[model samples]
Target chain A: QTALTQPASVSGSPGQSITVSCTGVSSIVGSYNLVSWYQQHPGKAPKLLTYEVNKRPSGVSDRFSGSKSGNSASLTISGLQAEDEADYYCSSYDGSSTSVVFGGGTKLTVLGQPKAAPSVTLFPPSSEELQANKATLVCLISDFYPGAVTVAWKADSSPVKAGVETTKPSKQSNNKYAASSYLSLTPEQWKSHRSYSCQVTHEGSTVEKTVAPTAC
Target chain B: QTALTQPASVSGSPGQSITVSCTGVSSIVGSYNLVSWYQQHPGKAPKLLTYEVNKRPSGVSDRFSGSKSGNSASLTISGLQAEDEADYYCSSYDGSSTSVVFGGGTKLTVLGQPKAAPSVTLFPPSSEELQANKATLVCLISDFYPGAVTVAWKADSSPVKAGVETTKPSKQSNNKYAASSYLSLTPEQWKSHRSYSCQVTHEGSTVEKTVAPTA
Candidate 1:
């Protein structure tokens, strides 16, 4: 087992309580009952919030708490305040790897920070590159807020999984984000598919962009 | 008996170590040793960093360590990271008040968030009010970065301890800060003292503003 699993983000208003969950396999999170949570803000190091499952260090607020159930461990922030807005992460000891594995990370936003959608564009390969060897299509996703998105590439109605890559979102100076996805194709495969679409799912919603009908 | 004592702020660069100290009287911090430390950032609730001197609960980083020496206690954040920038407060259980007493709080700034000086202005009471009964002077500090500042009132270079009131710095809409201090005066005292000065010391530097041409 490598890293644990956690949500990309969670939101709540002030005075409300929110719980973040972490899940892992039976060997680690299930077996040792070893789990911890950390609170992080932008540009700062992560601070220990809870350890040994739910033990709060001295001087920490009682509003920040933790617990565990079977293979899942949870950290709860009660009586949410405006100051509680930040990023949070959970980690567990991987008995198999004999190392600490951390979840991707979760961003906690209060009521004021709302969701913003991304701008999507698709591009096909140049004939010179297509004539030489392998052909590739690129889909660019830009100006998204929150930075979390699920990308998928499909040819017509069928899934194209073999040569698809979507890079992580990068923050721009304007405080937005930009990311790109790629798909590789062989000459024969390129000629067969009529059209290809790039789809992005964010905040439980999905959107797609597609290139014009092609020879493939 | 009321509040524990702490420095207004501390500064540290990344990869460095900084220690915050808390001092209390013998009956409380000195007696039961029930001291704790909290880490706070602007607009955030307080998070406990250490309790019972140096004990860290589950999941916290080893980079944060704590210890106690007599009536004073200390918390140290080692191998400081940029995220370590925030405010810190030390507190102890006061047996006399049977309550928890907190220090004034300390602001921790990394290199990127350098300290800024405050602008100060002083004014006197309205002439009509000064003629009737009680008179007071006001000293306002504005457009400063970082919230902590020390205020003092002086009459002809002498400390005026009795009727002085200073408010904590307030953040401004422009992302700077401002605060006000007041000096209550007697009608007789106002005429006796020709000029009064408002002294604000911020980031270890001092600034004074005075009213001109007294009656």
Candidate 2:
């Protein structure tokens, strides 16, 4: 059986404690107490929690605990706070098959403080061509909560007018949830090379993304 | 780490079969099903019958099977016969704390004419003459099928009758079954050198014995 490792990214406010879960078959982890935990922050690598199933790494506060009663083991945090914010993951050594698997990333959000909301940006917002006569564009956003998302196109940074058509939502099924939107423009609109803006609505926050495409 | 092993014992008449079970903890047991099986004759020690939990030992018949999954392992014998009767035990290494435990002994009885009437017996705990006479227990199993059981009592020679002053329907936890009987006799009665006995009953084609030491 193949084991997996997780992508890195998670954050929260001064008080909230967040948890991420890792799952796998018994043929791997159930044989021994060889499971471990890890934590990581932005721009840095991960820290290890090598203690046995129930023990914690040295210097770890009592607020954190580990357990392995049945087939599954877990890492828990008692209190939630801003400084306590960070991504957590569980890992285990499958000595029999010699492999490890990690869970998907989980991002935590602190409810208050405006600047805490990270920035989102888009590239290649617009493009045009002679043969196709129409330009298709893309909008990208990041650092926002995975589940909450919204995207729309507006002409010259103004509200979207009725004449344009767009595509529906297709999820990427990433460790984190993300949504995308596709738009089509007519030949005349494409030739105009009009300046269009892509803005996103996410988790009650709003961000605008700008991009332009040139014909080859 | 060392793997656990079990002894194979089987017996049955035409068309009947028998099986025995074994269990193990994490560690070696979980490591790719590393278990083994053995068979023993009348009084001799056991012989290896299966190895690696699933593989049959060198010369053993395929009819004897061994399998293990997760924390437990087991052995099964099919198509038993009268001559196959013997005492069987399964042993395993508990990876935790480096300890080992054995399954209670099993006696396989082959079908035949009732050699004799089956019987029962009971006995008290220990008779160490300490300052305080400890509360003791007397245990016995019923006319169980397939095999017979042996019970022992400490500090006595005369056999005590089964079900005498003991509680009914004894229970077993972790393989060992036990029953208790209250010894309400006064300390003065024990001081007289009076002895108590534990009774054991065994059933076979020709032999039946209720054993206890005599004064």
Candidate 3:
């Protein structure tokens, strides 16, 4: 059940190539081909890149390749693009240990100019959600670049912390990145007529949206 | 990219019952039944407890139950025991976002005295692996109670870093815990035959097993 070891960070210029390594046991990567790699933008859930050594799921670019030697597995991204700049993680299933191991993660920086600022929007909870005394506020941030962003929630301009879930930024089909943050609130708090705001920061630009809960 | 929300910690006495909640969105939990739960002891890989909401895999106890309501999911453990104390995480599939979301994780503590210590062993890289210049060392720790333990490695009495992987301890059918750690090395390092050791700490008792590469 040992976790994998990965580099802290890797960087390369656009159009260049970079390789990330994840080392594991022979009983895992060597004996079996269950090693998989994931690509995650800043503040986003990981997406599967390469699985079972060199196998790629449909829709994944062939530029993303995986290989293994002995106990070490490697992921090579050829012709790297700005969208490639993100965090990468490697995982493997150990036969002898009979468990799954994930690496600490490696951050990849494409080394280029910053992209567009994030577009922020807020959505109030559903009527059914509000009737159940549960409220879910959504903060959607999209069209950001370089894959790095920060999100925060405020109630009437005061920081709110309870039941907050911030997702990792996800890569979009259009080469942009999108992310969401959820703030859970009670119906009482929602009905208080206080303004709930979702704040997003990307590459020094801060954008925010505020909304008050509607009567259920 | 919203993350799941969970309590920071939950605790109860032995034989008591406890439940942990994971709140998500309709696009993830409420719309799809792709919710799953994992239990992880310290310094170990997480073990799948419940998948697809309430469906438990074979061999899992009936005491563990999962349910979903609206946009939230919950995992309940009945007749709790000391072994049930660990970290719990919930995950779900996001239909709109087309990805999986994981909770931050919740820690569960069982109030009781420390239990037994682990038996530790170390294995050198196989001849085939060494010949290929890819060497791997394994540390096996087994039969520990209370399910909390730490693992570390030292090369030539110096603390080793880099190329190390530690798995989460998993609960055995006998109510004990077993875990392993791996140290990846080059054939050059293996041929050096430097002394290497695996150390395990459980219930304040430190157990270690030392081994060196063999030709």
Candidate 4:
């Protein structure tokens, strides 16, 4: 009952090629060819790339190829485009129980010239996602380029560290990059009416957007 | 990208307790409390048991508990009984990509009295799943009791091995048990029009089901 192993991130220049590997135990991926791969951009649903180890579904690009050997499988993208830079995930049917396991996800960054700073927006958590004691905030960054950027958070100008998750930059269909970060807070902090900021640094410039705490 | 690590199978007797572990990297589960657990019985959708490390959903039993320590988490089930047998999966939100990853499922078996033999069904691969070269077969067993069963397969009356995967029996809400197994094959072997059989043995009784190759 273990997830397959995969690298955290991979990178290549535009027009180059790259491969991502997913490895599992012999009883799962080794004994059976039921491995699948997926590509996901930020705030988008994952699309299946390959299934049954090497078979592609209809409409998938021929540039995407899959293969398997021993306990590991691989997905190779040829002639990578800027839009190909996104998170990739692999899944294997756990042979024992008819359930599927997923890889941690890999970030593919297509290197190019540095681009402009991103547009940032901060959204408060919904009531369903918020509890009497905790709240979650989302910071969205869009229209960025180069696939390399930095995101940080501050509460009333003091750096907030714990319970922060920053997503890898994902390339959009428009050839721009989009990413998101999440910040968790206590209900007392949310009710304090303090100012929270999401800071994005790219291309030697930093852009910060501030949001004040409000009622759910 | 590596998913959380969990054992393939766990077992206990009636009134016993068991714990399942889900281990991950320090940068993910260790840094955030975004671990969750799910329970799935055969042929049914999965149910969320725990989320945000230790918070249980409304209406779930208090017998289930979750906890996390630096890089690893555990789900403990107390007062395990025959009705508590099913498959369990763990998920963690990978901090790097805003994506949630799932661990391979773990099977929980509760040893109990022998009840009834399972009914078996063998289904061939769909037209979409079969290419000109490769195929898969599934063996579904259901409506048995006592939470114990064994499944095997044969091709052309000869014992088949090498690509068989048998699932642990899962108890249904009605106290019956269900399970499934898979057989992998090449197109040549599948198109040979040979006879394949799925065998299930439970409570000293055996049930054999056979299916022929057809479009």
Candidate 5:
């Protein structure tokens, strides 16, 4: 079994870029090309950003992106916005048992002015190229054991592996697991198009599942 | 890109028991048993425990265990000894094609007695049941691309040539890789028998490995 190591916290000012590291021996990023990153609000669920180590999940802000070097994984948020001042984490898979591991939360304290009601800055920031509403993005997992996780879409109720655009990892750090995802349309796109969302899977007591907001 | 939410501290007394919980949303723990736990003493590498959700790595105190319910995962340490005081972290495998997430760590603090004069626990606790003159206790992983990784015996200062054991899982999980490993014992095995180590391996541009003990 493998374990992950992360720095306690890091800081960066608004408009300033910062880098946080996820260090480990054998990586989910290395074994699998699909390393991902997410942001968490104080008491809210997390949102997607980086995936496959560099590519951003659909709807993720371009400000959030991933990069790696030998032995070290990084999630870089550039032009930091006030809303980007929440927490950040990096994840990876083992490709075998459907196991996953995450970084200890990294607290990002924004140091400057609130631009436009504290806009969130993620790498691969949302772009116009993707469908406005009908298109959805999600991450998924395979071969995972039960009693290891829970899935929720903005705290909504659902079953594991049943929702759309979801990603799942193992509860064990070094154990193997597989994750993948899909995408749906953005809020604006939903005006005339049907709503779509990202889904997540888990193996909690009842196998929890969640889907991203269809109209946010 | 989901982050973590955690309490800053958790404490217990020697002989007493306590637990630390990590919460996530639609992350892997809510998805699978890829969750693992770690114990990190100040300024040292974190050690592995309750792997694959509940399997205690060889040498890990049976007193330490893991259990999960809903969006929360729990790591329970029963024999709360002073030596157990350290930072405990719960990690989940997100996906190789995407992201992995870890709970914000819980600092386990001990009240007193220092517990049995203080003892050290090792991570990657592996055992050797080989029926050969030289037995190997190896840590195994079989899914990364290129699969070229490092086997660092941080428990001891020497390099170990781990033997790879591959099969079809006698049953398949993900439909592809299922592997195991072994470590050889030497005259100086005592040095590692009591220490925890970090196995260094390359995953993508980073090293995703574990720190544990072996016998």
Candidate 6:
């Protein structure tokens, strides 16, 4: 009745180790050796990591390992490398009323390489969007490494989450990543606020892109 | 509560045109311009082909077109090329109880290439499996092109569907394809039959592999 649970994110430095967990009830995870792990790079089909609870399919890297204890399953990444930064997901057979259930997926961030702060650009709403009574502010983040970032919006330097929508990191052709965040509000509300800021935190440092009210 | 309907397969040779169809009832296909089509090559993420029925997204080849009439939608691939031999699927927004339902993909075979017939191998059940009171016969088909094939099993030259399972064509390192089928039966059924055969039909040609009982 429920999908498998996993942490939203996990991180490790190059040459370090990290473990991600996926949990389910006994009805699914309780079944011994029914779990499979998959490694998915950006914009690619998921490659099988491990099957039958710890058996590596031929051609998979040995750095990835899997184990299950009771109702929880775990995948350990030993000797993490820069190329190991990708999303990992786990699935089980006969887990649903019919079969084959997958976890929500976890993003593995392999750090220690030269991480770049995002170049932030905030786009104000166009006249067309403002005229609709709902304005959307887009904060475009580009050219960053290790892909994960925390975004927040601020009105006059005061934090607000009233209308914020951020996207998952998108891969670029240069192996860097890009992302976007949208802040929505009424045109009146946008006008009342003199300056709004898009703050993105990457690699423990926050960068801000500000936009003042502009007449389109 | 239901998925979109699509044909299991469709075919056309190079320079020929073929149209594949997808259909849904009112609530979905009824909504104007809510459908999308995706092109997925083997082992790759689906690339959006068209959005809102007949609108092709930027950079998509103009030869691939989409159209809808009432509850039915169609994708027309004109002037087929060899690189277009891939799977295509259609989807819609709010086609589901919640949203975003997908079609059971269609395999577009752009024929006229040098197609290769599958080499078939049939393996008898091992003694371990036979001792378990059930036997499984495996038919391995390899090195075929355009990837679509129909498989059948025969016991003493009579057709049988009993415990037959086949896999989708798996692409190998070469551009050719490979597939497998397993036929299961009880020990008595295997013993009673003098011979069993696996027949695979590809591109209108049939290839057979037979396994005979040995001491």
- Comparing 2 with 4 on lDDT, the higher-scoring candidate is 4
TM-scores of the candidates are 0.43, 0.29, 0.36, 0.34, 0.35, 0.45
User: In DockQ, how does model 5 score against the reference complex?
Assistant: 0.07
A39-71: candidate 3 lDDT, tens digit per residue: 865333357787777888678999999999988
Off by over 4 Å in 4: A28-30, A94-98, A113-173, A177-202, A205-216, B1-215
Per-residue C-alpha lDDT of model 6 across residues B1-215, encoded as one tens digit per residue: 34477876778888989999888834563344667787877545456787678887578999989988877889999999989988887766441222244677787887655778886656676554565566766666667887889999999989997777665565655667766566768888899999999999987889887777644
Ranking by TM-score: 6, 1, 3, 5, 4, 2
For model 5 chain A, the run of ten residues with the poorest summed lDDT: A116-125
Writing each residue's lDDT as its tens digit, candidate 3 over B1-215 gives: 34578876666778988999988645453336767787876544456688768988787899999999987899999999979987888877543333345687777878564466775555666544455567767665666776667777888878788776654455654566666566778878766756888888776678887776542
- Number of clashes recorded per candidate: 17, 17, 17, 3, 119, 0
Best TM-score among the predictions, by candidate number? 6
lDDT of each: 0.69, 0.44, 0.71, 0.70, 0.49, 0.72
Top-DockQ structure, candidate number: 5
Restricting to chain A, the TM-score for each candidate equals 0.49, 0.42, 0.54, 0.56, 0.48, 0.53
Per-residue lDDT tens digits for candidate 6, residues A1-216, read 235798989998878988989898245344445677777664344566877778886778899999998888899999988778888877665322323455777888876777788966565665544555767666666679878899999998899868765655655545577666666678888899898898999989999877777642
Alpha-carbon lDDT of model 3: 0.71
Prediction 2 TM-score vs. true: 0.29
| Model 1 residue B136 lDDT score | 64
lDDT of 1 by residue, A23-136 (tens): 882353345655778787643445668777777767679998889888888999999876687888786663233434566678897774447787665556535345566566
TM-score of candidate 3's A chain against the true A chain: 0.54
lDDT of 2 by residue, A129-209 (tens): 224344444343333443456667776667765432222221122213333333445656644555667777766777775
**lDDT (Cα, 0-100) at A150 in candidate 6:** 93
Query: In model 2, how large is the Cα lDDT of residue A111?
Result: 44
Error of 5 at A82 (Å): 13
Q: Name the DockQ score for candidate 2.
A: 0.01
Each candidate's interface RMSD, rounded to one decimal?
23.5, 36.0, 24.8, 22.7, 24.8, 25.5
